[PDB]
User: What shape does this take?
Amino acid sequence: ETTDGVYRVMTRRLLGSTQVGVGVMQEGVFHTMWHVTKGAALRSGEGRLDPYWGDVKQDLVSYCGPWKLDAAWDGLSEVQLLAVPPGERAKNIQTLPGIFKTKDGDIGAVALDYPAGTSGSPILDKCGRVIGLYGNGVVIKNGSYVSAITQGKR
Amino acid sequence: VDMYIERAGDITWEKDAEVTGNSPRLDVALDESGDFSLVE
Ligand SMILES: N=C(N)N[C@@H]1CCCCNC(=O)[C@H](CCCCN)NC(=O)[C@H](Cc2c[nH]c3ccccc23)NC(=O)Cc2cccc(c2)CNC(=O)[C@@H](CC2CCCCC2)NC1=O
Assistant: This one.
């Protein structure tokens, strides 16, 4: 129920299901963006995953334990978005990150546009480590999107 | 509201992948609610 991998985050009512996000299972902890779940409990197979930690400002939340993803973008190399869009197979998209320049340091950022329910898709370095999650970003003048490479503290 | 997860794949790097997108350098601010904004 906690096997490592990338997962879709779904909701079901009285009809079909909707994909609201994506997350990463690593070391028995599920990692996703706060705006995907709002810290609601997650059903996994027969079991239940409970929120352990989160921070609305980082837009992150973990389940079952503390945040485990500590890999950092090197500021130099290309990365891969492992995009898991609603209703589509997981696909790797390679890109050279731009940068969000903030008063509190620079954050790598990827100029890739996907549906809202792709939120929480992991961003990878060349060794396959997750250097952050996709889906909290900005819209620029031409209407395209730039996502921060959002990474938590371990 | 049944919120649940389902596996979508293994987390691996894809050899010979599509390289795309630009690399913008943007001045941004982050508020306490987790929203980025562009600096004018
Ligand atoms: N708008 C474009 N081009 N792309 C977005 C990509 C969304 C990726 C996943 N992340 C989110 O859903 C977060 C949630 C909220 C997190 C909050 N802390 N959200 C966002 O970061 C932004 C934030 C934001 C809104 N305003 C701003 C102004 C300045 C700076 C930042 C922002 N929120 C939006 O982007 C909301 C929005 C605003 C305007 C229009 C649309 C959505 C409608 N677009 C879509 O329906 C899809 C369309 C793509 C589908 C795949 C093919 C390419 C197109 N794209 C999109 O929905």
In short: Helices of chain A lie at 34-37.
